[PDB]
Amino acid sequence: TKKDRVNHCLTICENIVAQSVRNSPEFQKLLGIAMELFLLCSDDAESDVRMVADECLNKVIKALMDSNLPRLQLELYKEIKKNGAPRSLRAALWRFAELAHLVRPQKCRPYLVNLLPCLTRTSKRPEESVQETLAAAVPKIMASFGNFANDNEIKVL
Known part of the structure; x- marks a missing residue:
């Protein structure tokens, strides 16, 4: 089912880009887990889950390039x-x-x-x-x- 994975991706994505501090070690633990989540979802059978995780990778990268390229x-x-x-x-x-x-x-x-x-x-x-x-x-x-x-x-x- 697409709905569970789409909502999970968009929730993790929106949580990471909306957070303003962007510099704590617990944020870098969460960030690694989100890169693993979206790159897993890039391989899913359901086309909507692939498209959403691609948009989430592009969002979270462009939201964090000033702050976390050395972990992205x-x-x-x-x-x-x-x-x-x-x-x-x-x-x-x-x-x-x-x-x-x-x-x-x-x-x-x-x-x-x-x-x-x-x-x-x-x-x-x-x-x-x-x-x-x-x-x-x-x-x-x-x-x-x-x-x-x-x-x-x-x-x-």
Whole structure:
């Protein structure tokens, strides 16, 4: 049934964006649980649950980019590292490729080293939907991180 999941998503979404403090550790615990909730709902059989969780990811990202990118991008990476179902993987992949230009020079080297194993796993997959998302993601990820690579890391890619 769509109604239970739609109402749960929209409730968690509205609770997180309406909260003004945006900086406590308990808010970051709740935020991780919401990124897990919406990226799970991105894979649901019911099309309304997918559409709502996509709108909730886009809302909660744009509501928090001034305050919590260093956890929004961590949870999107924690989904790409799992190598899961096509929809939840894609729902993290294209979002992480948008947010890649906002990452600090202080963290580009860590994120590249952590993403090379993900990029060389997601490249193996038979799904043309995942491969067409990866074709949009690589040009944006490498424009953000490609100066932080060693020559051997480029060759492995």
